[PDB]
Amino acid sequence: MDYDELLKYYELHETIGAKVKLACHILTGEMVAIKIMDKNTLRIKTEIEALKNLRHQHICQLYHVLETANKIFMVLEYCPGGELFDYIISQDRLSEEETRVVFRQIVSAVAYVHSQGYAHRDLKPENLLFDEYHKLKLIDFGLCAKSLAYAAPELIQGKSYLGSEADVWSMGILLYVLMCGFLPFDDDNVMALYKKIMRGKYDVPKWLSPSSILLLQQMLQVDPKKRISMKNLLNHPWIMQDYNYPVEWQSKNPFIHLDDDCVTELSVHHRNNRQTMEDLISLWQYDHLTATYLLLLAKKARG
Ligand SMILES: CC(C)COc1cnccc1-c1cnn(-c2ccc(N3CCN(C)CC3)cc2)c1
């Protein structure tokens, strides 16, 4: 009963990870990742609402939501490059230059999330995946609003906070891990870790440049009001080094504009006219029609 409707649209492959299954969209032949959630074993509603309203080059795209009596299925953008967490480990640590390449992509996604009125609240390398073009995609918006090693001091303490300030702190931890390959605050004991985060003191390895050190101090402030704002992160001197242009955070992936080639390709599978087809896609119901349209756009982007 749980997989009946899903099997009308997707050919299921292997379980890779909520359970995560790889699959192929029948109509287009495009690969997808399907996140499966048991309604009676559980956050799902939070992530769905957010993802329906977020659409960006650095956010893992939601294509289709299906619901049964026991399950909720979320069909998502295929990211075969795997986790940034596994990537950092495989490389030991990244140079400042490669860190900047990946960090500017994280800044792009996070700034857009804040521009839409949300805060991610769970930024960490396990939540960033590489796609086939080696571009980062931000995942898991289950804790989003309108892990302990990455949490801001105020968030752990159960104090009132601004999600944007907690995200900037988490991005500071990410920046450190990218250039060092280990956490700034770490301990086997949870209370000793909590003490280390509240104190805000960390080791500064010899390989970090003066500019990297200054940017880390600006993000890693225990006092959230002393943290750099997202707007100042966009054109920060360290961020601009070797680029000379601020981070492009605006979305290149629209809700309004439709691609004529993909509307044409999609229309052959339906008994409706052109205008009816465009009006239906524009409703963004995250049904099979939404999935088909967005997967045709990903197929076109490959060519
Ligand atoms: C299981 C976790 C990574 C969580 O995954 C997710 C969580 N929330 C949203 C999206 C995803 C998601 C999106 N794409 N993939 C993914 C796609 C393909 C592959 N392999 C890599 C190696 N290759 C040779 C075979 C295919 C691995 C992972 C997972």
Q: Is 29 in the pocket of ligand 1 (CB under 6 A)?
A: no
Q: Among 28, 41, 84, which Cα is nearest to 60's?
A: 84
Domain membership flag for residue 138: yes
Domain membership flag for residue 161: yes
Q: How far is the CA of 82 from the centre of ligand 1 (A)?
A: 6
> What CATH number does the domain containing 293 carry?
1.10.510.10
Q: Which residues contact 111 (CB under 8 A, 6 or more apart)?
A: 230, 233, 234, 247, 249
CB 262 within 8 A of CB 128: no
Give the residue from 188, 207, 240 where a domain finishes. 240
**Whether residue 228 sits in one domain with residue 103:** yes
**Whether residue 153 sits in one domain with residue 133:** yes
CB 261 within 8 A of CB 300: yes
Q: And the tokens for 53? A: 């309203």
Query: Is 107 labelled as part of a ligand binding site?
Result: no
Give the residue from 210, 240, 270 where a domain finishes. 240
**Whether residue 224 sits in one domain with residue 99:** yes
**Whether residue 40 sits in one domain with residue 139:** no
The strand order across the sheet containing 82-83 reads 82-83, 128-130, 136-138
Q: Is 143 in the pocket of ligand 1 (CB under 6 A)?
A: no
Residue 11, domain extent = 6-78+254-302
């349209």: which residue's tokens?
A: 293
- Between CA 292 and CA 265 the distance in angstroms is 10
Domain membership flag for residue 184: yes
**Could you list the active site residues?**
122
Domain membership flag for residue 263: yes
List Cα–Cα distances, 15 to 18, 20, 42, 132, in angstroms: 11, 6, 20, 19
Domain membership flag for residue 196: yes
- Between CA 75 and CA 36 the distance in angstroms is 9
Counted domains in the chain = 2
- Between CA 298 and CA 76 the distance in angstroms is 12
- Between CA 210 and CA 71 the distance in angstroms is 51
Q: Is 19 in the pocket of ligand 1 (CB under 6 A)?
A: no
**Whether residue 202 sits in one domain with residue 182:** yes
79, 134, 137, best to mutate for ligand 1 pocket (most atoms within 8 Å of CB)? 79
Supply angle C-alpha 70, 73, 75, rounded to 5: 175
Q: Which residues pair with residue 33 across a beta bridge?
A: 22, 76
3-class DSSP string for the chain: CCCCCHHHCEEEEEECCCEEEEEEECCCCCEEEEEEEECCCCCHHHHHHHHHHCCCCCECCEEEEEECCCEEEEEEECCCCEEHHHHHHHHCCCCHHHHHHHHHHHHHHHHHHHHCCCECCCCCHHHEEECCCCCEEECCCCCCECCHHHCCHHHHCCCCCCHHHHHHHHHHHHHHHHHHCCCCCCCCCHHHHHHHHHHCCCCCCCCCCHHHHHHHHHHCCCCHHHCCCHHHHHCCHHHHCCCCCCCCCCCCCCCCCCCHHHHHHHHCCCCCCHHHHHHHHCCCCCCHHHHHHHHHHHHHHHC
Domain membership flag for residue 295: yes
Q: Which technique was the structure solved with, according to the deposited record?
A: X-ray
Q: Which residues contact 189 (CB under 8 A, 6 or more apart)?
A: none
**Whether residue 57 sits in one domain with residue 96:** no
**Whether residue 54 sits in one domain with residue 130:** no
Q: Is 139 in the pocket of ligand 1 (CB under 6 A)?
A: yes
Q: How far is the CA of 10 from the centre of ligand 1 (A)?
A: 16
**Whether residue 281 sits in one domain with residue 144:** no
**Whether residue 159 sits in one domain with residue 92:** yes
Query: Is 19 labelled as part of a ligand binding site?
Result: yes
- Between CA 184 and CA 195 the distance in angstroms is 13
**Whether residue 217 sits in one domain with residue 121:** yes
**Whether residue 236 sits in one domain with residue 263:** no
Query: Is 196 labelled as part of a ligand binding site?
Result: no
Rounded to the nearest 10 degrees, the angle between the axes of helix 210-219 and helix 163-180 is 150
Q: Which residues contact 251 (CB under 8 A, 6 or more apart)?
A: 55, 56, 57, 112
Q: What is the resolution of this structure in A?
A: 2.0
Domain membership flag for residue 144: yes
**Whether residue 16 sits in one domain with residue 92:** no
- Between CA 12 and CA 295 the distance in angstroms is 16
- Between CA 7 and CA 13 the distance in angstroms is 11
């977020």: which residue's tokens?
A: 54
Domain membership flag for residue 245: no
Q: Is 35 in the pocket of ligand 1 (CB under 6 A)?
A: yes
Q: How far is the CA of 240 from the centre of ligand 1 (A)?
A: 31
